[PDB]
């Protein structure tokens, strides 16, 4: 899986970034131009102190570093036949006349091209598979199931009671466990024609069986040939791939200029049309109409939407190159891994709406000014910059999602003016994961806060940034109201969530809604992502609509407080693979390589696990017998339940606090307890024979399921006790045994499989899940939920993390500009698995009408002072004309126009503070400013008229 | 008429509707089909999220057109 990537400018560096994090084989770069400080508006790679040396030599160092499996070189020269060395090509910044070269070549000899361009608002991606390309997964989506209640001679499949089948017509599907029909549940996959949603034919199938009964259908995923086209006998009748139907008839018109372009370019030194130009404008348009009318297309060409491709030929957004980014590396994933259905062929994409009108966008003010923003003023203006500079942004996160995010700010340059500012936040911290790389975040940067890392890792990509990013470890909740309380907002311009739960979605969002600050949301699962905004007085807010009940569990990286048992199979995965793999894989290529050292001492982020490795399970940590692999597996249950969270209760007594203050342990799931192993506690002896099983599997030696084994074991080991780097590494090194003494002897590596049952694979996932629940008090679930559950997680995917963090800037170009239409933003959705995207204008937010007045059911709202309950009724009854019939503060009912008058008598005078504190039997905190009530009220008709919530201000 | 609808998953749903049909009606029947509250379901046509209270025709949505159903995602 050889992949090859000319041009390492935004696009380029993003697309290698994502393929680095994916993981390929090998990844070489060819980019030998001289590097500018344009380059610098989206490419993160590039100092200001490296201009003038090439890119990829600079690059090459940064991007090695992502991912240790995935080496990446660099080539200086490039020859037609060296391209025979790589599994896919990719081509930015390159003429259509190279481009025509390459693509001829690499589709004669079958290989992937993809091309790919970033132009101001304006993306363009092509694919080229070969004429005779296997895609093994169409869609990605696990395969389906049911229960079949019966199957009629003819093939009538029917399901069990009124379940849904939901297979399209032309899907295979194996049987099993099929009563009647014997031959049918072999394996062989038959054609599915739907009459129904809960029946199906297949066939007439009577020479199996004169009927079958209660089984269990299963879908297979059938392989499909792809024949692509050369790029140039694409050329002429092109194949769209459109982004948004509601933009139909712009991808010939992009079609038509992103050649144009290539052609100005050729015909004026390489140089291309200037920022905002006029006359380079009507060279271009005259490009297009020639190369219009040479490949003979019927189209009409709209003059100004194609001369905005020239007035923006010049910008690099970074927005715009993450998001072709992610959308390119998946695609060279789908080129490289077989999986996937992959755009056919053409793809052209622009966020045209994203263009400043508060502010001129002239020749003038897009000029270039010799800076790094270059590359993005040429498009919104060194007006609209400063906007940019002058921004107060609340990250709410620094995972994976804010990462890019704070990338994105960087290279925009956000907040880095006078009055900017920005606030991140995120109480996890950066822990180990042997099978999850990250962006910014190293190895060696484990044990930090990931916010204060991603904040270092931004201001050293734009050092303008510090001193202007204050990085908060909260958790964002009811608790945390104290430091991110009206001061904090009062003085915010926007706020990105980059969470990966629900609640803490809809929590930032009620904030948002209270203080009338404009929030940006984005969501992501495997390949599939989602984007939307609101806007206050605007839109509707996220909590405004709900969602389907989630089918699968996506995790991004491993918690450090979990609180679902998914957390807990995930964790038990991530150990088995630092037990039962990745050591062992260590010691085979150790007496496989004779330079394995020589090389681990610079390939390796990490040289001192290498060495450990290497030491503990060849020598140090040899089984020679079962119950030795017992022992093992009672030291491995001391390490992983017992010692480590003595030392992480150490590192944290249950009353620490962060760095404002606050109680570092959260709220929802307290703090762990430890561990004391007894193996009459079945979890305990579970664990114990599962980890013994797998760690004499890797020896070959035989595993034993007779307790009697264990107890003899076990009755006479106890692990030690427990309480709470230059020449050490050489020392541990030259302590091996000679690689000379190869036997041959292999280390078996455990191949991670969840749909055998005899392998002790899923035990041991269960026994650990269940372990580290108990730690954290969670529900534990047994050998046949964990194995569901198991099959029901998703790895996110750096692409999709891409993509949103690229249509959220998009939407935060439009929020700062201070749009008011609806029609111009977009909530976006896309699945790279079959290359859909799409976008939508935001629902409006529901306007109302009292007393003859429109207001806002969501951002509208009353304020009043802290009265008492009979003057908050007297002034809706006389200023609004409303007989007030519920008020409500949070969860808690305060008044009701039917409640006895003894009762009432007692809350009628009081103030509302006073009232919520009685109701509540829980005082107000001193840094409580504001109170929220909701209420329910009657017109002079007697008939309830929906209003809106009411700010007590105290 | 006859409409098409496809879904994040990538699977596509034919529905025999008429021009004239409520947002509401629609719903309804990809609920029938696939058994999704109309509440939840997130349908788009040419850049526009179907609000319930319309028609297809005030979004002017005419045979063999394709509406997107679409959910948002947490991960
Ligand atoms: N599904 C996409 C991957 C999710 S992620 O990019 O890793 N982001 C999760 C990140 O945000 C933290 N998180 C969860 N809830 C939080 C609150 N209330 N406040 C701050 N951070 C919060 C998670 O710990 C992850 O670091
Ligand atoms: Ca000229």
Redesign the interface.
Same mark, same amino acid.
């Given at each position: 899986s050889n992949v090859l990537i000319i041009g390492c400018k935004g696009l380029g560096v993003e697309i290698a970034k994502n393929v680095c994090l994916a993981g390929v084989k090998s990844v070489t770069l060819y980019d030998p131009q001289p590097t500018r400080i344009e380059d610098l508006s989206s490419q993160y790679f590039l100092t200001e102190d490296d201009i003038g040396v090439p890119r990829a030599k600079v690059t090459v160092s940064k991007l090695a570093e992502l991912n240790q499996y995935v080496p990446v070189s660099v080539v200086d020269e490039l020859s037609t036949e060296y391209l025979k060395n790589f599994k896919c090509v990719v081509v930015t910044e390159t003429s259509l006349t190279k481009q025509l070269e390459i693509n001829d070549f690499t589709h004669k000899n079958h290989i992937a091209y993809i091309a790919a361009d970033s132009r101001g608002l304006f993306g363009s991606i092509f694919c080229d598979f070969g004429e005779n390309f296997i895609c093994t997964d169409?869609?990605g989506?696990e395969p389906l199931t049911g229960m079949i209640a019966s199957i009629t001679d003819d093939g009538v499949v029917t399901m069990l009671e009124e379940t849904?089948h939901?297979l399209?017509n032309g899907d295979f599907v194996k049987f099993t466990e099929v009563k009647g029909m014997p031959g049918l549940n072999d394996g062989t996959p038959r054609k599915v024609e739907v009459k129904g949603?809960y029946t199906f034919s297949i066939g007439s199938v009577k020479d199996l069986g004169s009927a079958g009964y209660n089984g269990v259908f299963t879908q297979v995923k059938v392989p499909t040939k792809i024949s692509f086209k050369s790029l140039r006998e694409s050329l002429k009748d092109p194949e769209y791939v459109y982004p948004?139907?509601?933009?139909?008839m712009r991808p010939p018109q992009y079609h038509i200029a992103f050649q144009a372009l290539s052609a100005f370019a050729d015909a004026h030194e390489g140089s291309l049309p200037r920022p905002r130009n006029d006359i380079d404008a009507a060279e271009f348009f005259e490009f297009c109409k020639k190369i219009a009318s040479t490949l003979q297309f019927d189209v009409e060409l709209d003059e100004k939407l194609i001369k905005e491709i020239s007035y923006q030929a010049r910008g690099d957004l970074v927005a715009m190159s993450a998001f072709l980014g992610g959308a390119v590396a998946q695609e060279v994933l789908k080129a490289t891994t077989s999986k996937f259905?992959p755009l056919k062929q053409y793809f052209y994409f622009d966020s045209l709406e994203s263009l400043p009108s508060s502010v001129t966008i002239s020749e003038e003010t897009c000029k270039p000014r010799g800076c790094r923003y270059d590359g993005q003023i040429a498009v919104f203006g060194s007006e609209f910059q400063e906007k940019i500079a002058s921004l107060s942004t609340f990250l709410v996160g620094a995972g994976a999602i804010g990462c890019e995010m704070l990338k994105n700010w960087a290279m925009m340059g956000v907040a880095t003016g006078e009055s900017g500012h920005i606030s991140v936040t995120d109480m996890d911290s950066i822990e180990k994961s042997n099978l999850n790389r990250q962006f910014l975040f190293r190895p060696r940067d484990v044990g930090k806060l990931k916010s204060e890392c991603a904040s270092t890792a931004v201001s050293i990509m734009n050092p303008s940034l510090t001193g202007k990013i204050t990085s908060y470890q909260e958790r964002v909740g009811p608790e945390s109201e104290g430091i991110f309380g009206d001061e904090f907002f009062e003085k915010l311009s926007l706020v990105t969530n980059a969470?990966?739960?629900?609640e803490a979605?809809m929590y930032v969002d009620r904030r948002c809604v209270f203080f009338e600050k404009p929030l940006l949301e984005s969501?992501?699962?495997?390949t599939?992502?989602?984007t939307?905004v609101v806007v206050p007085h605007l839109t509707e807010s996220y909590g405004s609509?709900?969602?389907?009940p989630?089918k699968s569990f996506? +995790?991004?990286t491993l918690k450090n407080f979990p609180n679902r048992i998914e957390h807990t199979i995930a964790w038990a995965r991530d150990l088995f693979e630092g037990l039962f793999k990745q050591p062992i894989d260590n010691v085979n290529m150790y007496l496989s390589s004779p330079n394995f050292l020589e090389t681990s001492l610079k390939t390796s982020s990490n040289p001192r696990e290498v060495l450990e490795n290497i030491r503990d399970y060849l020598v140090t940590e040899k089984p020679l017998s079962f119950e030795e692999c017992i022992m093992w597996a009672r030291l491995q249950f001391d390490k992983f339940f017992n010692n480590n969270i003595q030392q992480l209760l150490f590192n944290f007594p249950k009353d620490s606090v962060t760095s404002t203050g606050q109680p570092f342990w959260s709220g929802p799931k307290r703090a762990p307890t430890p561990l004391s192993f007894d193996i009459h506690n079945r979890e305990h002896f579970d664990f114990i024979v599962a980890a013994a099983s797998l760690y004499a599997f890797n020896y070959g030696l035989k595993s034993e399921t007779d307790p009697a084994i264990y107890e003899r074991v076990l009755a006479g080991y106890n692990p030690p006790p427990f309480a709470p780097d230059k020449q050490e590494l050489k020392s541990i090194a030259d302590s091996l045994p000679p690689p000379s003494s190869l036997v041959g002897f292999r280390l078996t590596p455990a191949e991670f499989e969840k749909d055998d049952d005899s392998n002790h694979h899923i035990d041991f996932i269960t026994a650990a899940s269940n372990l580290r629940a108990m730690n954290y008090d969670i529900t534990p679930a047994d050998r046949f939920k964990t194995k569901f559950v198991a099959g029901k997680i998703?790895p996110?995917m750096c692409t999709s993390t891409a993509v949103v963090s690229g249509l959220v800037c998009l939407e935060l170009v439009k929020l700062v500009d201070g749009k008011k239409k609806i029609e111009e933003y977009?909530?976006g959705?896309?699945?790279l698995? +079959?290359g859909?995207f799409?976008?939508?204008?935001?629902?409006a937010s529901p306007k109302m009408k009292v007393n003859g007045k429109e207001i806002d059911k969501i951002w509208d709202r009353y304020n009043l002072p802290d009265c008492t309950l009979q003057e908050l009724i007297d002034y809706f009854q006389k200023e609004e004309g409303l007989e007030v019939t519920m008020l409500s503060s949070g969860v808690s009912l305060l008044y009701a126009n039917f409640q006895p008058p003894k009762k009432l008598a007692e809350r009628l005078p009081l103030k509302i503070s006073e009232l919520v504190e009685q109701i509540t039997k829980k005082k107000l905190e001193p840094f409580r400013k504001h109170l929220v009530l909701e209420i329910c009220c009657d017109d002079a008709n007697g008939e309830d008229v929906e209003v809106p919530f009411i700010c007590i201000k105290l | 008429m006859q409409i098409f609808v496809k879904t994040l998953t990538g699977k596509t749903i034919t529905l025999e509707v008429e021009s004239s049909d409520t947002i509401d009606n629609v719903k309804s029947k990809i609920q029938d089909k696939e058994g999704i509250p109309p509440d939840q379901q997130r349908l788009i046509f040419a850049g526009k999220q179907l609000e319930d209270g319309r028609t297809l025709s005030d979004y002017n949505i005419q045979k063999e057109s394709t509406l997107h159903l679409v959910l948002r995602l947490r991960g």
């Open positions: 169409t869609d989506n849904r939901g399209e949603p948004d139907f509601g933009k139909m259905y969470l990966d739960n629900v979605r969501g992501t699962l495997g599939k992502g989602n939307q609509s709900q969602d389907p989630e996506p +995790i991004c998703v996110a977009k909530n959705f896309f699945n698995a +079959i859909l799409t976008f939508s204008d935001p629902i | -």
